[PDB]
Design a protein around this ligand. Structure first.
Ligand SMILES: O=P(O)(O)Cc1cc2c(O)c(c1)Cc1cc(CP(=O)(O)O)cc(c1O)Cc1cc(CP(=O)(O)O)cc(c1O)Cc1cc(CP(=O)(O)O)cc(c1O)C2
Ligand SMILES: O=P(O)(O)Cc1cc2c(O)c(c1)Cc1cc(CP(=O)(O)O)cc(c1O)Cc1cc(CP(=O)(O)O)cc(c1O)Cc1cc(CP(=O)(O)O)cc(c1O)C2
Ligand code: HEC
Ligand SMILES: [Cl-]
Length: 104
């Protein structure tokens, strides 16, 4: 079982620079992530995505989010998300446990 509290710290240190999670939170370098799970990639209104992210056209879930976060440019070549990857499966599980609740 992932640990959301550890996930929240991982989000703060690794993601928060570029992303907010709450409903009505602002777009920053990256898009606000409210409602990300169960939505197709590249669909947050008011954000200018790469065609790479739009045409990947993946329905985000816990599993493909983990694949993506391992290595974003591998999963979506051409993406403008400048993030190398979360190496540790436990860190991905914790982060995603947090993100599923925080973006709900
Ligand atoms: O309008 P935009 O800009 O916001 C976004 C956009 C729209 C289109 C574009 O050609 C490109 C970008 C260029 C492009 C980029 C990549 C990414 P990359 O390889 O990294 O460079 C990849 C592709 C691109 O063509 C390969 C590609 C992938 C699929 C799978 P899928 O993504 O749908 O699941 C289907 C098509 C397709 O060419 C046919 C197609 C279908 C529809 C839907 P519809 O029928 O509603 O019109 C619209 C367009 C299409 O070409 C038009
Ligand atoms: O499978 P892929 O391919 O999609 C993704 C992948 C997997 C591995 C890779 O070596 C690379 C890429 C190459 C690489 C990339 C970056 C990122 P960037 O420089 O931006 O390009 C950074 C590094 C790379 O070596 C430096 C690096 C950083 C840390 C975090 P930290 O210690 O600084 O905090 C930990 C390791 C590490 O080498 C050890 C480590 C742990 C685990 C998970 P586990 O231990 O569970 O096996 C797997 C691999 C590891 O090397 C294998
Ligand atoms: C800035 C330096 C970023 C950091 C750090 C992280 N992300 Fe990001 N992300 C960023 C951009 C600029 C974009 C859009 C990319 C594009 O090619 O258009 C993104 C995108 C995402 C997405 C996809 C969103 C969608 O399809 O609507 C997700 C799910 C995402 N980012 C998550 C995320 C997480 C969890 C991060 C920390 C591990 C993270 N990103 C870091 C910019 C930046
Ligand atoms: Cl900001």
């Amino acid at each position: 079982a992932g640990s959301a509290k550890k996930g929240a710290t991982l989000f703060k240190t690794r993601c928060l620079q570029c992303h907010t999670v709450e409903k009505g939170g602002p777009h920053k370098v990256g898009p606000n992530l409210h409602g990300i799970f169960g939505r197709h990639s590249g669909q947050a209104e008011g954000y200018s995505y790469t065609d790479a992210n739009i045409k990947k056209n993946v329905l985000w879930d816990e599993n493909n989010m983990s694949e993506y976060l391992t290595n974003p440019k591998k999963y979506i070549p051409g993406t403008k998300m400048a993030f190398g990857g979360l190496k540790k499966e436990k860190d991905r599980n914790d982060l995603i446990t947090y993100l599923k609740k925080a973006t709900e």
